[PDB]
Amino acid sequence: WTATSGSCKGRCFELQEVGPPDCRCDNLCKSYSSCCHDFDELCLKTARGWECTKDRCGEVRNEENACHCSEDCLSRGDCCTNYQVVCKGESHWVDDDCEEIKVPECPAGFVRPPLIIFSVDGFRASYMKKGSKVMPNIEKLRSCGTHAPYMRPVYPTKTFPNLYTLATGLYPESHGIVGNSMYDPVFDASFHLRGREKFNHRWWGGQPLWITATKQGVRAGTFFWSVSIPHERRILTILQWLSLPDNERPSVYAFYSEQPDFSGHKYGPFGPEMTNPLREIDKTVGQLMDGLKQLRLHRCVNVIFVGDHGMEDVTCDRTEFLSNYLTNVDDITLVPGTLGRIRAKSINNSKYDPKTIIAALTCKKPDQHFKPYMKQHLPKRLHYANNRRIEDIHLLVDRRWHVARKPLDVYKKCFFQGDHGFDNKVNSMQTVFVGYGPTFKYRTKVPPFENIELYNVMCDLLGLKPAPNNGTHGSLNHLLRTNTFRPTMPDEVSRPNYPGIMYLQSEFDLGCTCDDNKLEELNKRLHTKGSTKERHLLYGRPAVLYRTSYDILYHTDFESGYSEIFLMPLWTSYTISKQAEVSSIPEHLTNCVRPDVRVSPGFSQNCLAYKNDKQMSYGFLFPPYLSSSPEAKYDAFLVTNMVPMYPAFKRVWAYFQRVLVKKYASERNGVNVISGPIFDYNYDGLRDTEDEIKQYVEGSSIPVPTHYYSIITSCLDFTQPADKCDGPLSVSSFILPHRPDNDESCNSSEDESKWVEELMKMHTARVRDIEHLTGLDFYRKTSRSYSEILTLKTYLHTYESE
Numbered sequence: 126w127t128a129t130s131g132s133c134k135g136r137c138f139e140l141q142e143v144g145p146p147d148c149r150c151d152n153l154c155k156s157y158s159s160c161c162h163d164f165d166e167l168c169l170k171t172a173r174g175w176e177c178t179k180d181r182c183g184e185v186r187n188e189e190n191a192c193h194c195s196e197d198c199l200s201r202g203d204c205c206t207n208y209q210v211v212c213k214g215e216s217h218w219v220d221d222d223c224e225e226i227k228v229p230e231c232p233a234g235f236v237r238p239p240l241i242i243f244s245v246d247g248f249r250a251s252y253m254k255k256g257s258k259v260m261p262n263i264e265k266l267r268s269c270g271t272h273a274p275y276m277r278p279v280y281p282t283k284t285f286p287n288l289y290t291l292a293t294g295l296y297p298e299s300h301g302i303v304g305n306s307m308y309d310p311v312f313d314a315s316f317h318l319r320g321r322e323k324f325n326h327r328w329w330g331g332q333p334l335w336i337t338a339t340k341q342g343v344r345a346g347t348f349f350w351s352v353s354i355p356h357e358r359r360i361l362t363i364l365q366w367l368s369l370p371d372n373e374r375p376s377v378y379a380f381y382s383e384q385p386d387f388s389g390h391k392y393g394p395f396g397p398e399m400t401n402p403l404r405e406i407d408k409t410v411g412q413l414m415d416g417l418k419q420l421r422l423h424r425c426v427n428v429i430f431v432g433d434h435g436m437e438d439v440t441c442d443r444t445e446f447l448s449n450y451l452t453n454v455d456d457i458t459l460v461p462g463t464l465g466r467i468r469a470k471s472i473n474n475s476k477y478d479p480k481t482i483i484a485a486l487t488c489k490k491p492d493q494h495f496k497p498y499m500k501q502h503l504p505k506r507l508h509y510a511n512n513r514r515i516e517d518i519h520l521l522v523d524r525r526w527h528v529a530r531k532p533l534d535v536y537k538k539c540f541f542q543g544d545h546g547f548d549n550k551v552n553s554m555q556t557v558f559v560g561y562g563p564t565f566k567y568r569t570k571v572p573p574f575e576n577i578e579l580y581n582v583m584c585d586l587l588g589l590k591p592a593p594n595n596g597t598h599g600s601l602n603h604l605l606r607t608n609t610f611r612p613t614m615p616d617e618v619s620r621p622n623y624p625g626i627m628y629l630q631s632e633f634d635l636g637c638t639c640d641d642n643k644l645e646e647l648n649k650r651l652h653t654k655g656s657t658k659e660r661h662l663l664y665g666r667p668a669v670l671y672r673t674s675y676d677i678l679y680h681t682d683f684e685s686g687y688s689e690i691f692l693m694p695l696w697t698s699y700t701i702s703k704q705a706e707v708s709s710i711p712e713h714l715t716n717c718v719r720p721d722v723r724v725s726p727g728f729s730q731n732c733l734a735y736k737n738d739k740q741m742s743y744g745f746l747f748p749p750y751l752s753s754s755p756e757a758k759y760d761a762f763l764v765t766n767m768v769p770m771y772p773a774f775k776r777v778w779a780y781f782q783r784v785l786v787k788k789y790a791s792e793r794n795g796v797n798v799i800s801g802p803i804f805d806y807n808y809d810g811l812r813d814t815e816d817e818i819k820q821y822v823e824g825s826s827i828p829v830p831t832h833y834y835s836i837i838t839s840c841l842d843f844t845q846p847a848d849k850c851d852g853p854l855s856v857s858s859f860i861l862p863h864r865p866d867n868d869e870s871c872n873s874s875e876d877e878s879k880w881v882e883e884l885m886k887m888h889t890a891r892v893r894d895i896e897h898l899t900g901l902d903f904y905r906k907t908s909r910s911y912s913e914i915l916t917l918k919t920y921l922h923t924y925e926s927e
C-alpha cells in the first residue's frame with residue numbers, strides 16, 4: 126500500500142528514497158506504482174518542449190515549462206540545453222574544436238571531477254564506424270577521448286547480466302543475475318523481466334558501484350530510470366543535480382537508453398529503420414554536452430559511453446525445436462532463445478535423466494545449430510557454471526539462431542529480426558567503450574578489453590577502493606592520464622626445492638620399463654643443473670601462491686615445477702625456435718617410462734596403475750617429438766614428465782604437440798610454451814585443494830586433471846625470435862577439457878587436422894583464467910612494466926575475423 130496522497134512539491138527526483146506507505150518522488154517511483162498524486166504535474170512538465178527558440182529568450186519565468194529560457198535559469202540550473210546557443214550567441218559543444226583536457230577545469234566547491242556513465246542498450250561495436258555520419262556528438266567523444274575498437278560483454282550477452290557486471294566487476298555466476306530469466310531452487314522463486322520479483326534485493330549479489338560510493342562517502346545520483354520518463358527529462362534531471370550545493374551534489378550519475386536495442390529487436394542490427402534511433406541517441410549526447418558546457422562542466426566531468434552487448438540478425442525460421450530431438454519433450458522446462466537452459470519439469474519425476482537428454486541432443490543432425498553441454502564442460506572462458514541458478518544442462522546456440530521447446534512456443538508466444546545472448550566472443554555481440562574527460566587520455570586508442578574491468582576504473586575515477594571483483598586492477602591503467610592504481614606482484618608463498626641425484630634405479634618398483642665419455646658427461650650434468658634454463662624459462666619461473674611442496678627439475682629441452690602432492694608437474698616450460706625440427710618417438714621407446722633419480726619412488730607416479738586402469742592412459746607435458754637430439758629425448762620419458770590422459774584426449778594432445786606447436790613456432794618466429802594440468806572438480810574457476818579431487822587413476826593416489834592448459838608466448842614484433850625479444854610480448858592460451866570422449870566435436874571420427882584446432886579455438890583462454898585455476902603467477906621476470914603485463918594476462922585470442 127502507498128498513501129499516494131502526499132506531495133512532490135519541492136521533492137522532484139529526490140535523491141533518498143522514502144519508505145512506504147509514504148509516497149515517492151524519485152526516478153524509480155513509477156516502476157513501483159508509488160509516485161505521489163502530483164508527480165506527473167510537478168516533476169514531468171512538458172509544456173513548450175525541450176528547446177529554446179529566438180522569441181523565448183529572456184522570457185518571464187513560467188514554472189509550467191519543461192525547461193527555461195529566462196534570465197535567471199543559469200543560476201537556477203534549469204535552462205534548456207540549447208539556451209546559450211539560441212539566446213547568447215554560444216556554439217554547440219560538437220562544433221568546437223577539441224582541446225586536450227590536461228587538468229580538471231571545475232567550478233569552486235568541486236572536490237573531484239564528477240563521473241557520468243551514459244549506457245546504451247544493444248549498441249553494437251560496428252555502429253561506431255557504420256553510423257559515424259549520423260552521430261557527430263558520439264564521434265567527437267570517440268576521436269577526442271580514449272576509445273577501444275570494441276568492448277567484450279560477459280556471457281550470456283543479455284541486458285541484465287551485463288549491466289550488473291558493469292556495476293559490480295563480477296561474472297554473472299558470482300553476482301547472481303545469470304540471465305534475463307531465472308529460477309532459484311533455494312528461494313523457490315523466479316526472476317523475470319516483467320514484474321515484481323526482480324525488485325527483491327536477494328537476487329542481486331556483490332557490491333554495485335552506487336553502494337561502494339555511498340559506503341565510502343561519495344554521493345551517488347540514483348542510477349535507474351522508470352521507462353516512461355523521457356530521455357530529455359533524464360538529462361535535465363542530471364544537470365539539475367549538478368547544480369545542487371556542494372554538500373548535497375552527487376559525484377556519480379548514470380543515464381540509460383533503451384535504444385538502439387529496442388529497435389534492433391524489431392528491424393535487425395542494420396535495418397534501414399536503425400538510422401533514426403542512432404540519430405536520436407546522438408542528439409541526447411549533444412544535449413548532455415551542451416548542458417555541461419552551459420554549467421562550465423564540459424572540461425570537468427569524466428563521461429563514459431558504454432554499451433551492454435551488440436545485436437545479431439535472428440528470425441523465427443531459424444529456430445531449432447527440441448521436439449525434433451526428444452520424445453519426452455513434456456518432462457522438461459526449457460529457458461529458450463539465444464541460449465538454452467534445461468531442467469526437469471517436476472523434481473518428483475525420478476525417471477528424468479540428464480545423461481540421456483544430452484545424448485539425444487548430441488550431433489543428431491548434419492547442420493545442428495546448437496550444442497548441448499553439462500555446464501561444467503562449457504569453455505572455461507565463459508565463467509558460467511558456479512551458481513545454483515544456472516541449470517546443469519546448457520545449450521550453446523549458433524549465432525543467428527534460436528532454440529525453442531516446441532513449434533507452438535514460437536508462433537503462440539514473424540515478430541523479431543534481431544536478438545542477442547550468444548557466446549561473448551561472437552563479433553556481432555561486441556559493444557562499445559569511449560572515455561572522455563580530464564582523467565582519460567587524449568585522442569588515444571586502446572586495445573579491446575572485457576567489461577568486467579570497468580568497475581575498478583570507475584572506482585579509480587572516483588577515488589574509491591573497489592570491492593573484491595573479477596577485474597584485474599591495473600590492467601586498464603593505459604586508459605588513464607592520472608589516478609592510476611599501482612599494483613604489486615603477489616608474493617610467492619612456496620619456494621621450490623632443487624633436488625639433485627638421490628635415488629638409485631633399483632629403489633623404484635613402479636612397473637615401468639625402458640629400452641635404454643668426459644666431453645658429453647660434463648654436458649648432461651650442466652643441463653641438469655639448469656645451464657639451458659634461460660632458453661626455456663624466458664619470463665622467470667611462475668610463482669606458487671599457495672602452501673605446497675614442489676621441486677624444480679631442469680633438463681636440456683625443458684624445465685618443470687614438479688608437485689610432490691599431486692605427483693606431476695604444475696607447470697612445464699619449453700622454447701621451440703622457428704628452425705626446430707619434429708622427430709618421432711623411436712620404436713624401442715614407444716612404451717618407455719624412466720624413473721627420475723631426483724624424485725623419491727614415494728612421490729612418483731607408477732606404470733602399474735595405468736596398466737590396471739582400463740579407462741586411463743598417459744601423456745607427456747614436454748612432447749618427445751620436439752626433443753633437441755636423440756640423447757635429449759630420454760629426458761622426455763621421465764616419470765616426472767608424465768600425466769594422466771584418456772585415450773580420446775590423447776588424440777587431441779598428440780596433434781597439438783606433434784603438429785600445432787611447430788606450426789606456431791614457424792608462424793610466430795619461435796614460441797615459448799608453458800603447459801600443465803588443471804583440477805577444477807567443483808567448477809568454481811579456482812584451483813582445487815587435494816581434498817576436492819573426485820577422480821584418481823585406479824588403485825593409486827594419482828589425481829586426474831579436469832583440464833590441460835597451455836600458454837604460448839612470442840615477441841609481438843615477430844621479426845625478433847621469441848628467445849631474443851626486446852619489447853612487447855604476444856600470447857595465446859587455452860584450457861582444454863580433459864574428457865573421456867570427443868562427443869563435443871561432431872567431426873571427431875575424422876582426421877585430427879579437421880577438428881582439433883577448432884576445438885582448441887573454442888577453449889581459448891586468458892592467462893588470468895589459468896592463474897585462478899592453478900594458483901600460479903606467470904611473467905614474473907620481464908623487462909616490461911607490470912601494468913603492461915597485467916594487460917597481456919587479460920588478453921583473449923578470439924579467432925573471430927575483423
Ligand SMILES: *[C@@H]1O[C@H](CO)[C@@H](O[C@@H]2O[C@H](CO)[C@@H](O[C@@H]3O[C@H](CO[C@H]4O[C@H](CO)[C@@H](O)[C@H](O[C@H]5O[C@H](CO)[C@@H](O)[C@H](O)[C@@H]5O[C@H]5O[C@H](CO)[C@@H](O)[C@H](O)[C@@H]5O)[C@@H]4O)[C@@H](O)[C@H](O[C@H]4O[C@H](CO)[C@@H](O)[C@H](O)[C@@H]4O[C@H]4O[C@H](CO)[C@@H](O)[C@H](O)[C@@H]4O)[C@@H]3O)[C@H](O)[C@H]2NC(C)=O)[C@H](O)[C@H]1NC(C)=O
Pocket residue numbers: 295296298299300301327328329330331508511512513593594595809810811897
Ligand atoms: C570473482 O570474484 C569474486 C569476488 O571476489 C569471487 O567470489 C568470491 O570467492 C570467495 C572465495 O571462494 C568467496 O569466499 C567465501 O565467502 C563466504 C561468505 O560468503 C558471503 O559473504 C560475502 C561477502 O559479503 C558475499 O559476497 C557472499 O555472497 C554470495 O552469496 C549470496 C547467495 O548465497 C549471493 O547473493 C551472492 O551473489 C554471492 O554468491 C556467489 O558466491 C558464493 C560463494 O560464497 C557461491 O556459492 C554462489 O554460487 C555465488 O557464485 C556471501 O553472502 C564464506 O562463508 C566462505 O568460507 C568457507 O570457505 C573457507 C575458505 O577460506 C573455509 O575456511 C570456511 O570454513 C568456509 O567453509 C564453511 O562453509 C562451507 C560451505 O557451506 C563448508 O563446506 C565448510 O565446512 C564451512 O562451514 C568463503 O570464504 C566469496 O564469497 C566470493 N564472493 C562473491 C561476491 O561471489 C570469485 O571467486 C571470482 N571468480 C573467479 C573465477 O576468480
Ligand SMILES: Clc1ccc2c(-c3cnc(OC4CCOCC4)c(C4CC4)c3)n[nH]c2n1
Pocket residue numbers: 242244284285288289291292334348349350351352379381
Ligand atoms: Cl528495461 C530496463 C533494463 C535495465 C534498466 C536500467 C539500468 C541502468 N543502469 C544499470 O546499471 C548501471 C551500472 C553502472 O554502469 C552503467 C549501468 C542497471 C543495472 C541494475 C541492472 C539497470 N535502468 N532502466 C532500465 N530499464
Ligand SMILES: [Ca+2]
Pocket residue numbers: 804805806807808809810811812813
Ligand atoms: Ca575449484
Ligand SMILES: [Cl-]
Pocket residue numbers: 281283303304305306460
Ligand atoms: Cl536468459
Ligand SMILES: [K+]
Pocket residue numbers: 735736737738739740741742
Ligand atoms: K590404461
Ligand code: NA
Pocket residue numbers: 867868869870871872873874
Ligand atoms: Na565426436
Ligand SMILES: [Zn+2]
Pocket residue numbers: 247284386387390545
Ligand atoms: Zn535486447
